[PDB]
Design an enzyme around this catalytic site. Sequence first.
Site, PDB file in Angstrom:
ATOM      1  N   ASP A  33      48.994  34.306  43.925  1.00  0.00           N
ATOM      2  CA  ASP A  33      47.850  35.141  43.586  1.00  0.00           C
ATOM      3  C   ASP A  33      48.038  36.166  42.478  1.00  0.00           C
ATOM      4  OD1 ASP A  33      45.099  35.760  44.230  1.00  0.00           O
ATOM      5  OD2 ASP A  33      45.815  37.558  45.272  1.00  0.00           O
TER       6      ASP A  33
ATOM      7  N   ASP B  97      41.969  35.391  38.519  1.00  0.00           N
ATOM      8  CA  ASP B  97      42.570  35.344  39.858  1.00  0.00           C
ATOM      9  C   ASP B  97      42.984  33.920  40.228  1.00  0.00           C
ATOM     10  OD1 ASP B  97      43.396  36.087  42.432  1.00  0.00           O
ATOM     11  OD2 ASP B  97      41.441  36.914  43.010  1.00  0.00           O
TER      12      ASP B  97
HETATM   13  C1  LIG Z   1      40.921  42.682  43.045  1.00  0.00           C
HETATM   14  C2  LIG Z   1      40.660  41.264  43.544  1.00  0.00           C
HETATM   15  C3  LIG Z   1      40.381  40.301  42.389  1.00  0.00           C
HETATM   16  C4  LIG Z   1      41.762  40.760  44.500  1.00  0.00           C
HETATM   17  C5  LIG Z   1      41.480  39.378  45.116  1.00  0.00           C
HETATM   18  C6  LIG Z   1      42.686  38.831  45.898  1.00  0.00           C
HETATM   19  O1  LIG Z   1      43.855  38.921  45.127  1.00  0.00           O
HETATM   20  C7  LIG Z   1      42.493  37.404  46.412  1.00  0.00           C
HETATM   21  N1  LIG Z   1      42.479  36.416  45.342  1.00  0.00           N
HETATM   22  C8  LIG Z   1      43.488  37.039  47.520  1.00  0.00           C
HETATM   23  N2  LIG Z   1      43.005  35.932  48.330  1.00  0.00           N
HETATM   24  C9  LIG Z   1      41.727  36.129  48.982  1.00  0.00           C
HETATM   25  C10 LIG Z   1      41.217  34.957  49.831  1.00  0.00           C
HETATM   26  O2  LIG Z   1      40.147  35.060  50.406  1.00  0.00           O
HETATM   27  N3  LIG Z   1      42.002  33.826  49.906  1.00  0.00           N
HETATM   28  C11 LIG Z   1      41.558  32.756  50.675  1.00  0.00           C
HETATM   29  C12 LIG Z   1      41.054  31.637  50.023  1.00  0.00           C
HETATM   30  C13 LIG Z   1      40.599  30.548  50.763  1.00  0.00           C
HETATM   31  C14 LIG Z   1      40.647  30.573  52.154  1.00  0.00           C
HETATM   32  C15 LIG Z   1      41.150  31.689  52.810  1.00  0.00           C
HETATM   33  C16 LIG Z   1      41.597  32.760  52.058  1.00  0.00           C
HETATM   34 CL1  LIG Z   1      42.220  34.147  52.874  1.00  0.00          CL
HETATM   35  C17 LIG Z   1      43.290  33.717  49.203  1.00  0.00           C
HETATM   36  C18 LIG Z   1      43.976  35.045  48.959  1.00  0.00           C
HETATM   37  C19 LIG Z   1      45.180  34.841  48.035  1.00  0.00           C
HETATM   38  C20 LIG Z   1      44.452  35.636  50.288  1.00  0.00           C
HETATM   39  C21 LIG Z   1      42.040  41.778  45.621  1.00  0.00           C
HETATM   40  O3  LIG Z   1      41.194  42.070  46.463  1.00  0.00           O
HETATM   41  N4  LIG Z   1      43.286  42.284  45.570  1.00  0.00           N
HETATM   42  C22 LIG Z   1      43.654  43.247  46.586  1.00  0.00           C
HETATM   43  C23 LIG Z   1      43.983  44.593  45.932  1.00  0.00           C
HETATM   44  C24 LIG Z   1      42.869  45.032  44.970  1.00  0.00           C
HETATM   45  C25 LIG Z   1      44.221  45.667  47.000  1.00  0.00           C
HETATM   46  C26 LIG Z   1      45.274  44.419  45.124  1.00  0.00           C
HETATM   47  N5  LIG Z   1      46.341  44.088  45.885  1.00  0.00           N
HETATM   48  O4  LIG Z   1      45.293  44.559  43.906  1.00  0.00           O
END
Ligand SMILES: CC(C)[C@H](C[C@H](O)[C@@H](N)CN1CC(=O)N(c2ccccc2Cl)CC1(C)C)C(=O)NCC(C)(C)C(N)=O
Length: 340
Positions: free
Chosen positions: A38, A226
Amino acid sequence: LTLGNTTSSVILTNYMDTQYYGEIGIGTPPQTFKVVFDTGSSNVWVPSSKCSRLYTACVYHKLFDASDSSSYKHNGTELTLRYSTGTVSGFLSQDIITVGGITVTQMFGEVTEMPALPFMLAEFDGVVGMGFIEQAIGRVTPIFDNIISQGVLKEDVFSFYYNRDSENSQSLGGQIVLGGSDPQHYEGNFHYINLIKTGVWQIQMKGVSVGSSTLLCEDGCLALVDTGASYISGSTSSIEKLMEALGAKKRLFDYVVKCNEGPTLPDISFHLGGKEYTLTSADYVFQESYSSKKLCTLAIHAMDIPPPTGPTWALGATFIRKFYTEFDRRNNRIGFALAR
Ligand SMILES: CC(C)[C@H](C[C@H](O)[C@@H](N)CN1CC(=O)N(c2ccccc2Cl)CC1(C)C)C(=O)NCC(C)(C)C(N)=O
Ligand SMILES: *[C@@H]1O[C@H](CO)[C@@H](O)[C@H](O)[C@H]1NC(C)=O
């Protein structure tokens, strides 16, 4: 920054064109996990054995048991990762992690709390953040950062390749090159766009157009690439607009259109770094049928990323499937080349 002469690839498995994951090993002996890489977040976690079995998501996923690793090193500081779609929590732990042949001492989170929604829908066990350290919860060093520190990778860059076909097995679901890129999955040249702010794989979006007119974000917006996101996404407003032009019937968690209408949907171009990256209906419409009696969802929907990162468009798999992406930590830039 010391550059070596190595490269490492991670074979990825394509799950329904919505989840791309590779395997990694942790502890001694190695305990394998299915993780999505990710670029959205920056931490590393896998479900922990110390996770209550009342969380059904833990009952259905591989669980790391520190009690089985001779290389494990305890830490225990509480940790919580709040993604825009779900949340996980656990404690920090250190152990050796094997990725693409490379071995590195890494601090990661052992999740003891993973809600059924969305994780019960996850085919993978955990995540491997490829985001910058600045966005790491708990100031924990990102895996890649540690790897780069070994002075063995050729370039301070890593690329992503996501295959279209998800159904075939004989083919590769996708590939990630650590220390460079793989010329076999892209053709033509790379076109870069520098990051806006450091610590985030986000860039300037000079407009999104839906076919004919440039009906979206004429004043500009941001796009966060992403590689851990299933689809492309815009602010709830922008998408209500974008769909309006498509005529998609909005539902609870996405937009759909009658299957017959699918093929005749107009293209969608994102103007990035002085280039138009256009997608055809076939690129963002899960065909799966042609009957007007059936419904077909779109690989695009509304999702409002809270500030400081949001609002922003998120370009996920739906975009990387057509455009091979390189992430340049050396020049805070992102290259986009046509996948092959
Ligand atoms: C900002 C945003 C684009 C970003 C999005 C985030 O990486 C997601 N792709 C992560 N994902 C979200 C999701 O629903 N995923 C997912 C996809 C299909 C089925 C189940 C799941 Cl759980 C994959 C993962 C990898 C778990 C975010 O929320 N970061 C957290 C925070 C902002 C706190 C950070 N760590 O920077
Ligand atoms: C966890 O790692 C951090 C970072 O080095 C360290 O400061 C902290 O004390 C560790 N946890 C403990 C108390 O063992």
